[PDB]
Symmetry: D2
Subunit: 93 residues, 4 copies
Amino acid sequence: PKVTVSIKVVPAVEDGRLHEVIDRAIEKISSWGMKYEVGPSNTTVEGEFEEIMDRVKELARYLEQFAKRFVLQLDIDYKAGGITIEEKVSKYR
Amino acid sequence: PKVTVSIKVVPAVEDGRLHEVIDRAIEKISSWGMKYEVGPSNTTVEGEFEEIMDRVKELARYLEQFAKRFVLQLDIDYKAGGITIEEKVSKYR
Amino acid sequence: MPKVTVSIKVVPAVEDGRLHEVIDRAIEKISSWGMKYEVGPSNTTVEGEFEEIMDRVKELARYLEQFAKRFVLQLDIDYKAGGITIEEKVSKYR
Amino acid sequence: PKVTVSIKVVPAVEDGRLHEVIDRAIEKISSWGMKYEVGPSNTTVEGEFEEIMDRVKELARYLEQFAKRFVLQLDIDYKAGGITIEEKVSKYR
């Protein structure tokens, strides 16, 4: 199935670099070719679950060059038969 | 100084009724008078920290009439001197 | 009478080498609340009355700003009408 | 180098079925052979990042037989050179 996965990076860097590491994470996520939405606290991608999990492997390795330590959080909405961003939000927009 | 607080409610109810509990939470959050944004995974409010914490107390009691069991998650971005939704997202918008 | 559990995670925007002092102060502060608590690898879980914990969280945030000008603070609340406890969720495994 | 990954499952089922789905998840996690710790809110594994991400793919598919909709949350502590459960908790135990 197609699912949604919200991704948050919290790097262990001095706060003046915080936003920058996050920008690299967002840019990387945007390269995946999947529908995505940047929010105030996370970035949500919509796509096939196993592909996203593989992309998350690449994202973590990529982020090492910018931050030696970071928290990476995934919030997955897993639904048999699929769930999309629009099904979750369109009613409130 | 403001903070952002992203709020996620995950009720223990059959999938068919998920959307209803969430609707009520979003409706209640919209009543607070604070700037807010509904995302696919959470709803983010911007405002004064202690007031938001008091509003969260009210939200949880309110939700109990719709779901007897739920997960409530707050992701708070706390910055001395304040932080806003725009400072976090506007460059992607 | 009804309790909730609330797991608390602090992630400070400080260099890796200072992460642990902020977290230590957070844990020390949580332990002063008098509530049953358990420190885990990723968070610290308290069991107690919901509104009291929310008020303690207000104090926690103010307290922590001395040690870190910017931090993420995450709460994961298990809310159950009539109450839920740590033991009801983990005793099976311990 | 290891990471720690804290896993939370929140199924969209009635409250009476909730702890059961979670037990199935914990049992499956225990089959991975990795050091793990069950807590009140999540179960933390320590091991190699990419292997854990592949086990998470299997976990989601497995859980589908019990709950057709669920939230699955990963909180990953990622450190250059590795990080362990003991490094994170042993000071407070």
